[PDB]
Subunit: 112 residues, 14 copies
């Protein structure tokens, strides 16, 4: 939506539709105060993800993973957010009867 | 009715009758704060559907599905709302003794 | 009575007697905020019928049915209200000991 | 009494005695807010009868019946009130120990 | 007493003694708001009798009966009050131990 | 005493002694608001007697009886009060142990 | 004492001693509001006697008895008070242990 | 003491000693509001004696007895008080253990 | 002490010592409001003695005894107080364990 | 101490030491409001002794004993206080465990 | 300490050290309001000792003993305080576990 | 982040990304009021670590270890913070289901 | 510390270190309001010791012991405080687990 | 830190690092209001140590030990604080699971 999403959505909206640049599909298991993830390069300001406070640590490339695992369920929360370029593919299917996490996303993210 | 329906109906009204352009038949299992769906191209503003927060994700065409499934019942909530052109056919028959969902709709939707 | 009946009757009155044009016999199982049905062509404003929120959906002719079924009983609530011309024949006999629904009506309705 | 009786009697009074024109014998099982029945031709304003809200529906002649049946008892509540001319014959004998309904009336009614 | 007796007596008084014209012997089982019966020809105003609200209905002559029967007991409440001339003979003997109804009356009544 | 005795005595007094004209011996079983009986010819105002509201009804002569019977006991309450001349003889002996009713009276009464 | 004794004594006093004229010996069973008996000829005002409201009724002479009997005991309460001349002899001996009634009196009484 | 003793003593005092004229020995069983007995000839004012309200009644001489008997005990309460001359001899011995009544008196009493 | 002792002592004091004239030894069983006994000749004012209200009655001489006996015990309370001259000898020994009454007195008493 | 000791000591003090004249040894069982005993010749003012109100009565000499006996114990309370000269010897030994009464005194006492 | 010690110590202090004149060793079982003992010759003011109110009585010499015995224990409380010269030797050993009374004193005491 | 981090993070943020100089990875089991560790050379101000108050004590080099061990679990909390140069490698894996401590850090730290 | 220590320490302090003159080691079992012991020669003001109020009594030399024994334990509380010169050696070891009394002191004390 | 540490730390801080002069390592089992130990030479002001109030007493050298033993555990609390020079070596290992006392210190301390 805006630069910094800064939003609990509350849930999905009038996603300001775009070309894939500014807006990214931040969604996947989320909630844990993520203003926006991706953009801007200025302070989102920052997010926790996975409704946890774990996140991956090794560096993939320049841009490099993070991956809170939420529950025991499949919780491949990635946010390769370095602030270089940026590729991540989320999916989600936890407690099968959930608040539909099923659909999965991918994020592109140029800052440039 | 108006541009943005913006309404809980409360229930069906003096649907401002038309040619099929502006007003669409948004109805089907609904409730989950859908102002209007379809029109306008300006902010409806947006809807949840299916009284859920699931919705389809793949892209059909340009205009492309979304489909919250409400209950376990037959809940083919489609809103192919892209904002290109637009075709969707809803029907509804859940808990057979319901608040008559039986009758089913179709939506046309040119923005043009 | 008036243009828009706009009334819970409360019950039948000094029905402003007429030729069959303006006033129609709206009666049959009713209650669910029907201001007036039929006339005017301007906003009645609108009615629910059948003390439900079901109503028929196919289009008969131009003017075309609607038919909330109230209970399980015989509840042929028709209001073919299109706003073309208009023919409907109601009858009523539900829970035999009711608040006499027995007598049945017919509605004419020219707007012209 | 007056033009529009407009009265719960409370019960029978100094019935303004007449020739049978203006005043009619409205009595029989009554109560259900009947101002006056018969006269005037202007708004009585209107009555329910039979302490019910049933009334006959077919048209006898121009002037034509109405007949709420009160209880299961003999309740031939007629009010052939069209506002043409007007003939009706009431009688009453319900729960034999009642508030004497026994005596029965007849109504004439010219408006002319 | 006065023109319109207009009185619950409270009970018998200084009955303004007369020739039988104005004052009549209204007494017999009474109570049910009878102002005066008989005279005047102007509004008594009116009476119920018999402590009931029954009264006879056929027309005897011009002046013609009315006869609430009070209880099951002998309750020949007559008031032939037409406002022509006027003859009635009351008697009373109900629950033998009563508030002495035993003595019985007769009413004359010229208005002329 | 006075013209109209108008008194509950309270009980017997300084009966203004007389010749038998004005004052009469009203006494016998009494109480039931008898102002005075007999005199004056103007409004006593009136009495009930016998502590009842029965009284005799036939006409003896011009002046003519009345006779409330109080209890079952010997209760020959007479008041032949017409307002012609006037003769009555009371006696009293009810519940033998009473408030001495034993002594009995006679009333003369000229108005003239 | 005074003209009208007018007194509950309270009990016997400084009986204003006399010749037997004015003051009389009113005493005997008394109490029942006797102001004075005997004198004056003007309003005592009056007495009940015998603590009852019985009193003798026949006429002895001009001056003539009265005799409330108080209890069952010997209660020869006489007051021959006519207001002519006057002779009476009281005595008293009731419930033998009483408030000494034993002593008995006689009354003279000239008014002259 | 004074003219009218007028006193409950409270009990015996500084009896104003005398020659036997004015002051008399009133004592004996007393209490029942005796101001003074004997003197003066003017209003004592009066006494009851014997703590009763009995007193003797026959006339002895001019001056003549009175004799309330108090209890069952020896209670020769005399007060021959006429207001002529005057002789009485009291004694007292009731409930032997009493408030010493034993000592007995005599009264002289000239008024002269 | 003073003329009229007028005192409850409270108990024995600085008895104003004397020659035996004014002050006397009043003591012996006492208490019952004796101001002073003996002197003065003016009002002591007076005493009861013996804590009773008995006292002797015969006359001894001019001056003459009085003798309340207090209890059953030896209670020779004498006060020969006439107001002539005066001789009395008290002693006391009642309930042997008492408030020492043992010691006994004698009273002289000239007024002269 | 002072002239009139006038003191509850409270207990023994700075007895103003002397020659044996003014101050005397009043002590022995005491308490019962003895201001001072002995001196002065003016009002001590007076004492009770022995915590009693007994005291000796015979006269020894001019100056002469008094002797309240306190308890049953040895209680030779003497105070030969006449106000002549004066000799007394007290001792004390009552309830052997007492508030030491053991020590005994003697009193001299010239007033002169 | 001061002239009159006048003190509950509270307990031993900065005893103003001396030559043995002014200050004396008052101590031994004490407490019972002893201001100072010994000095001054002016009012200490006075002491009780021994926490009692016994004290010796015979006269030793001019200066002469006093000796309250406190308890049953060894309680040779001497204070030979005459106010001549003065010798006394106290010791103390009562309830062996006491508030150390063990140490014993001697008092000198010149006033001179 | 800032010079002195001075922060409870609250948890990881928009870590002001850097070259490894200023910001260090302070993280590992922490909480116990660590403002910042490492930088600045000015007052962080200081930290506790390990959520304890233990820390290593020997000196490694100039810059030299500290190592609170938190729980029993693997708690190699090092902070070689001397303020020379600085090398430390943390890791963490305590209660395996923890608040992910798993990922481990390393700190560089030039002050220069 | 100061001249007069005047202190509950509260416990040992910055003992103003000295040569052994002014400050002395007062310590040993203490508490019982000892301002200072030893110095000054002016009012300490004074001490109790031993948390008792016993103290030795004989005189050693000029300067001479005092020795409250506190408990049953070894409680050689000496304070040879005369105010001449002064030697005392305390030690302490009472209830072996105490508030360490173990260490023992010695006091020097010149006033000079 | 400062001259007088004067601090409960609260716990270890930004120990103002030094050469070993001013700041000393006061630590070891402590708590018992130690402002600073060692420096300054001016009033720390003073400390208790060992969370006790024991401390060593003999003099080692000029500068000389003190050693509260805290618990039963190894509690070699030394503070050789004389204020000469100064050497002490603390260690600590009490209740093995403690608030890490394990690490041990040494103190240097020149005042010079």
């Amino acid at each position: 939506l805006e630069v910094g999403r800064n939003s609990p959505y509350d849930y999905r909206i009038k996603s300001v539709v775009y070309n894939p640049v500014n807006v990214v599909k931040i969604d996947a298991v989320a909630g844990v105060a993520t203003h926006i993830v991706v953009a801007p390069d200025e302070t989102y300001i920052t997010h926790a993800f996975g409704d946890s406070e774990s996140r991956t640590f090794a560096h993939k490339m320049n841009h490099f993973f993070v991956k809170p695992k939420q529950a025991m369920s499949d919780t491949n929360l990635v946010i390769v957010t370095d602030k270089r370029t940026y590729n991540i593919v989320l999916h989600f299917i936890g407690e099968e009867t959930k608040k539909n996490a099923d659909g999965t996303v991918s994020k592109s993210f140029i800052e440039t």
